[PDB]
UniProtKB/Swiss-Prot annotation:
Post-translation changes: Subsequent cleavage after Lys-125 leads to alpha-trypsin. Further cleavage after Lys-170 yields pseudotrypsin. A cleavage may also occur after Arg-99.
Protein known as: Serine protease 1
Keyword field contains Nuclease: no
Gene: PRSS1
Species name: Bos taurus (Bovine)
Lineage: Eukaryota, Metazoa, Chordata, Craniata, Vertebrata
A matching Pfam family: Trypsin
Gene Ontology biological process terms, A to Z: digestion; proteolysis
Keyword Metal-binding carried by entry: yes
Disulphide bond pairs: 7-137, 25-41, 109-210, 116-183, 148-162, 173-197
List of residues binding Ca(2+): 52, 54, 57, 62
């Protein structure tokens, strides 16, 4: 997260870190057994780390649970990033309390101008590289479809939206991938892609979660 703030420990209780020997992506806990992330975060051997603040220090609220199965969206295209969503099942159910909690799925799509909270352990610099240990947060608005398409000609599908600031300076970044965009207490986006980070006229692009609620629910019901 570039141009954000330190969230505070366990203030984003649905935020998970996906670990394969090291943090590599965010995700969002959506029930005791299941995490939503980006398909471009797929790999084998994932351990889901819930209750994290400092990802390099055991602070007392962690739950580390290996994934039993990952399901990339049936129509994910890794070239275009269309349908950049993946479900991860935990081998055991997480213990839920105020520091580790699921986030609700949307019942309706969000509109441009809605304010959201984007979070993660990704790079905090727009030029060069610095990875935080503690969770970072950014409040940002959803942008109009027309401004999103104008920013990224030929690239924005109906399964994507832009959020952030066209002036630059405030965005998600590498290592935030897969993590949440939460608006009015609902998971509306997944950190997906962008050109660099926090660049002028190049906002963040996010998977439009409201399009996937049917698929998420039916997948959970049978897996
Ligand atoms: Ca920790």
């Amino acid at each position: 997260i570039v141009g954000g703030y330190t969230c505070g420990a366990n203030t984003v209780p649905y935020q998970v870190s996906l670990n394969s020997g090291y943090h590599f992506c965010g995700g969002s806990l959506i029930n005791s057994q299941w995490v939503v992330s980006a398909a471009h975060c797929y790999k084998s051997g994932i351990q889901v780390r819930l209750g994290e603040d400092n990802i390099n220090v055991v602070e007392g609220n962690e739950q580390f649970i290996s994934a039993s199965k990952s399901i990339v969206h049936p129509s994910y295209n890794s070239n275009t990033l269309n349908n950049d969503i993946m479900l991860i099942k935990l081998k055991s159910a997480a213990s839920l309390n105020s520091r580790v909690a699921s986030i609700s799925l949307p019942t309706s799509c969000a509109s441009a101008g809605t304010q959201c909270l984007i979070s993660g352990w990704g790079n905090t610099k727009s030029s060069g590289t610095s990875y935080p240990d503690v969770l970072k947060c950014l409040k940002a608005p959803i942008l109009s479809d027309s401004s999103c398409k104008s920013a990224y000609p030929g690239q924005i599908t109906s399964n994507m939206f832009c959020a952030g600031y066209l002036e630059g300076g405030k965005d998600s970044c590498q290592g935030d991938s897969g993590g949440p965009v939460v608006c009015s207490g609902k998971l509306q986006g997944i950190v997906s892609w962008g050109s660099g980070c926090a660049q002028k006229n190049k906002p963040g692009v996010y998977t439009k979660v409201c399009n996937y609620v049917s698929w998420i629910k039916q997948t959970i019901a049978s897996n």
